[PDB]
Amino acid sequence: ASITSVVKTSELILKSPLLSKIVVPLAKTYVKFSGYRQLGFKMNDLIIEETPNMQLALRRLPPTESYDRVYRLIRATQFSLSHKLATGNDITKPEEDDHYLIPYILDVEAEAFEKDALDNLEVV
Amino acid sequence: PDPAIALHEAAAEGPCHDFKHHFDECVERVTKAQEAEDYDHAEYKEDCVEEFFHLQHCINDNTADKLFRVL
Amino acid sequence: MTAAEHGLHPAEYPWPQNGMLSTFDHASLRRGYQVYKEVCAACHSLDRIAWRNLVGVTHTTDEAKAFAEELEYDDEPDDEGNPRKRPGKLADYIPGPYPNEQAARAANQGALPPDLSLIAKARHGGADYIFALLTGYPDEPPAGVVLAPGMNYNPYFPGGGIGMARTLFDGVVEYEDGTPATTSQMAKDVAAFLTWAAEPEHDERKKLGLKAIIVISAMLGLSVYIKKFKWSPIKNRKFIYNPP
Amino acid sequence: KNVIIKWRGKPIFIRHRTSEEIEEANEVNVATLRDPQTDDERVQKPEWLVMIGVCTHLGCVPIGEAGDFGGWFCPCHGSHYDISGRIRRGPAPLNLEIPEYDFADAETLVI
Amino acid sequence: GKSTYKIPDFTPYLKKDRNTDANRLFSYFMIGSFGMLSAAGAKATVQDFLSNMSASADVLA
Amino acid sequence: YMGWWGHMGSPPQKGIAGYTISPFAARPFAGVVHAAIFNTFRRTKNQALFVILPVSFFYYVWTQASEKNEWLYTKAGRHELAKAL
Amino acid sequence: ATTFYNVFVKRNSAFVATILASAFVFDMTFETAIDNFWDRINAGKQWKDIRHKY
Amino acid sequence: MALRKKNSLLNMANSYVLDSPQPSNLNYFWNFGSLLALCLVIQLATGITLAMHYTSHASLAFDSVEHIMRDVNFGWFIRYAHANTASFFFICIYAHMGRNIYYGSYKTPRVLPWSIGVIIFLLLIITAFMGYVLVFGQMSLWGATVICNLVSAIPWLGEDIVHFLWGGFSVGNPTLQRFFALHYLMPFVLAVFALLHLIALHTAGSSNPLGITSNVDKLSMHPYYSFKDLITVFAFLLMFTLFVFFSPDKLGHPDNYIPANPMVTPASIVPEWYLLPFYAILRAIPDKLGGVIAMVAAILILLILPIVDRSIIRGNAFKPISKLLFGFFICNFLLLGVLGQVHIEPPFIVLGQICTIFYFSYFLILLPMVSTIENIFFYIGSL
Amino acid sequence: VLPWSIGVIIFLLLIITAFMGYVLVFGQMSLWGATVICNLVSAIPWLGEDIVHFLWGGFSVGNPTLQRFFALHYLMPFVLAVFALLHLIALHTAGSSNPLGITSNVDKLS
Ligand code: HEC
Ligand code: HEM
Ligand code: HEM
Ligand code: HEM
């Protein structure tokens, strides 16, 4: 899937009062059970990056954000290999789980999808 | 004489008594049914194999170890 | 399927050779050979066993050569190219009772007695099945069983009707070692013997397995020490991050 | 009686069918038959049922005289064949194949 | 948390006698044991396995 | 997507100090008893449902099916078998 | 202990030689030890135990 | 520059087994790759050895296997090792494929190693099936009969193809000789494809259990994974030893110790345990051709996982619903296995059909649905 | 030098492959070939005779020898193929020589 698709669909759900009332609590529990925060990851650290689009979005990250991401990946890898979980300040608190990457990938994809559309234009 | 004979008899009278009685009752029914005429022109002819298996399976469970101990 | 169609499953008897560290009882093997020779060999072949195979298992070299030398086997033709017989040698296979399948079936009301060299591996149950079968002919078939002609009722045999009649009765064999030859004793001995025939490497196999288990276990323990030793720098790594 | 002749490794069932057997086979309405055929299509001589005795399901050999339509019973998956060797009950899709056989003499056939 | 000259705490894992010959020797005894059983195991494996190529019992008769 | 040593394809790293000690200076089995007990308990407890639920369900299914099949091929199950065929 | 290290471990040529000599000794002695153990747990069962009758 | 890097030949070994950069957090399920390599080596060594004692003629095949068991020095070991390692090869291969599905190893950028892998799995099935026939016992024959009669369902040409493969009108001597030649050859083909899937993988490197990049933190393949691979080698050899020396016939079927008899059909023809799930799938479809297509599709459908998994996240470590669905999928695959060996009787007929539907619906319906919904939950749940 | 040296081994494997293949026919030249050639191994001091009997699988060329040569003759061509591939990979570093013996780096053709 494209991040664009995920973001658009999520926005449709958050708009509908009924839908949000039932989905947002589920999604919060899902994320709690998912347990990525116990390895000190932010959600966006889990998105697959071996794609041209994602490589481009990562290159567009501000240097600080990029350095921090590298640290979170290295730290998580070390907890994984040790079979330990994050404790204390290493655990990602819900307020720290910011979508740092979503804006960049949405811009990269926006252009890529426009390019595909315009490659198929027909002068009327 | 064959040790198995005594061990099998003892296990039938003792721990496998319910199964012994089942087989016996079955045999009674089937023999009586065979005695009656137009048995040969019946659809279903009952056997006692099931009950026999239940009994033998039980006897073997209670005897196997004891028998090989005396050979 | 009906249980009848499957056959009754044989009990698990405590054979001497059951057990990771247990060999066959060779005295039982010898007695079992004598039952084979005096009872089964009338109808059943043991084609995969040579006289040499008994040597140092059940019999001395002299006893086995004596058994071989009592028989006649086909020799190479003489100088006029006429057929000839010779006395048996240790390399000869134990000869069967019938020349071909047709002769075998004709003697057994149509049924073909299988070769027994692999029968312990060729039936679910193994020794237990052979033991159960030979000892499991009831005096009377369960009421309501209709036996086909030339069949005998035996619950362990799938379908119930077997072409082999009960053959082991108290004192059909006179054991040379003074063991009382009861039906159960003879079945236990012959079933041991046939199990040996099917897997003659059994004793050596289990001893080599014991050595293998020990060495491989030790190497496993040491491999874990070595792994943990070499990996400890990676497991013990620590980081300090100062955001730039 | 039914004979079993090996012919190309497959078994050949040859049954010398009695009068009443032929009658039994000529009863079943063709309509109600997975593989619709009459005995006349199968045999070229009503007293000589010649079939390839491999079951049409997977390819086990039916035990003859057994069954529920008293012809042949495949023990493998329990499919019942007729006195024509037509499939009546069980997994098997087709009737037991008929080889190409010709009566050279009235006492010998080639297959 | 900030100074990189303050080495993190390794005291749970540090051996006191780490620079002794005793210490090294022990670990090489483990490595050497493992090599010894591997050598003995390889010899056994090879010798048993290749013996299949020697004259079989029927030939020897 | 992966390079080689020296140009592996990491985003630039800066600001991480890594420290480790020699295998000969470390106790390889330090805290092994605590880990074998408490760590394994934690890790197993966390994953237990994902094994228990599917295994227990499929075992129940099989148990019911095998018991029915057994019963259909008894004398008592003759009629139910006749309908099932 | 330093002595032991210096002699048998420091040079790999010596270490490998020590491992192979140990392997030889282990192989020989382990064979003998298992043989005896196997004979004791399977006592009176093996051909060697009944051979004497013949 | 070091010789291992300078010299072209050495450098190829170096790049794969020594300096190869690996993620530092591979868990023990990454060890099945090397166990499969060990199985492949044991099968080549024992296989070539048995070929030196086996005779491919149908009048002599079964007897040659008895000669191996009875006369050849350590023949029993070589035979049982070869037969049991075939079972261990399938345990390891199912584990390795299970690892790949759970951790999303099939996703970009690793679609090519995965797709070659699916072919390796097909060649392993064919290899093992032909090897089974070589014994020429009852299961050998009745296996070859049944399986090669499925080819008859190919429309128009099917019958002709069967007779061409058998080299006659039934399974017999021609079939046995040709299966021997092919069974010898197929493991070499399998080795080449195994090597191709590794070369394909070298572009991306190994995935890891977190599903994130490992480019940030790599470890040389040697010594770390060398020594970790030894632990599973010794664990494998312990299991091998228990089967080969103590219970060599536990995984097999007694019927194969009866010489093939084209007349007598054995009590029950079931394949070797590792084929049983596909056999259950085949039984589920009543149509002969349908059944064959379904059975092949059950393997080829693995090729579409790269499409039907719509997740933005690689692997199941962090996806609780996907983990549950995967658990059900795996257990159903085992239930299919068990239903492959029951009799075709009520109530297992219907049950086998339901399990078959569940098997396919994982790829076609559930995985696409579940992966889509988890995408939305991760995004909304972290807002 | 490396492609050349691997090549010398390819040539040895080809000789062995062809020799074993010749024995498989089991005609007179097959047998008498295997007899004489495997008795050259008898010249290896001390262990020579033992090695011969081990290769034959008996005391003469017979069935054991024939079966083992079949298995090896099947296998050896695959080994030969691997070495053929190694000598090419080795050669890839320098590329082909040419009949003038000069560099071709100045003038290449696909
Ligand atoms: C005079 C005939 C005869 C004697 C004596 C005889 N058998 Fe048999 N046996 C048969 C025949 C006939 C069959 C085939 C039965 C059938 O397939 O219905 C058979 C079958 C067997 C079977 C195989 C049953 C199966 O599962 O297929 C075993 C095992 C067996 N015999 C062992 C023995 C042993 C052990 C003895 C004596 C110690 C023995 N037999 C004595 C005629 C004999
Ligand atoms: C002879 C059979 C096989 C051998 C010897 C083999 C060997 C290996 C090895 C050594 C690796 C790298 C180490 C590892 O991850 O375990 C690997 C990775 C892989 N194999 Fe296999 N393999 C075999 C069969 C298969 C099959 C059947 C599949 C797929 C259906 C497959 C798909 C993969 C994939 C996708 C990877 C990359 C996984 C990753 O590291 O993320 N292989 N294999
Ligand atoms: C992936 C590799 C292989 C697998 C999975 C495999 C599998 C099998 C299997 C399952 C059998 C049936 C074993 C039995 O029940 O007795 C067998 C037999 C056989 N295999 Fe293989 N095999 C492989 C490689 C080889 C190779 C390379 C050879 C080289 C010739 C070979 C030669 C034989 C021979 C001669 C037999 C028949 C003797 C026997 O049954 O033991 N195999 N194989
Ligand atoms: C199966 C046997 C062999 C095959 C298939 C094979 C194939 C080839 C091929 C395709 C090339 C590159 C093209 C060419 O120059 O002709 C080549 C080059 C070469 N081969 Fe072979 N070869 C084989 C045996 C040998 C042998 C026996 C030797 C040496 C004793 C050898 C030594 C070389 C050398 C030194 C080159 C480089 C020559 C150059 O281009 O200047 N090869 N071989």
Ligand SMILES: CCCCCCCCCCCCO[C@@H]1O[C@H](CO)[C@@H](O[C@H]2O[C@H](CO)[C@@H](O)[C@H](O)[C@H]2O)[C@H](O)[C@H]1O
């Ligand atoms: C490059 C490697 C060097 C060449 C490799 C040599 C291969 C063949 C050498 C020995 C093979 C025959 O050597 C012989 O081995 C077998 C078992 O393996 C041993 O046999 C011994 O152990 C086995 C079980 O382990 C018993 O069944 C046997 O009764 C006993 O004598 C002999 O005591 C030994 O004389």
Ligand SMILES: CCCCCCCCCCCCO[C@@H]1O[C@H](CO)[C@@H](O[C@H]2O[C@H](CO)[C@@H](O)[C@H](O)[C@H]2O)[C@H](O)[C@H]1O
């Ligand atoms: C697995 C068994 C062990 C034998 C090796 C497997 C045989 C497969 C090797 C043949 C394929 C060629 O392998 C290919 O070669 C070159 C160098 O060797 C590697 O190249 C890699 O390593 C070298 C240095 O080590 C670097 O210059 C290069 O930047 C890097 O990508 C490729 O990543 C690999 O794909």
Ligand code: FES
């Ligand atoms: S094979 Fe004939 S009934 Fe299935």
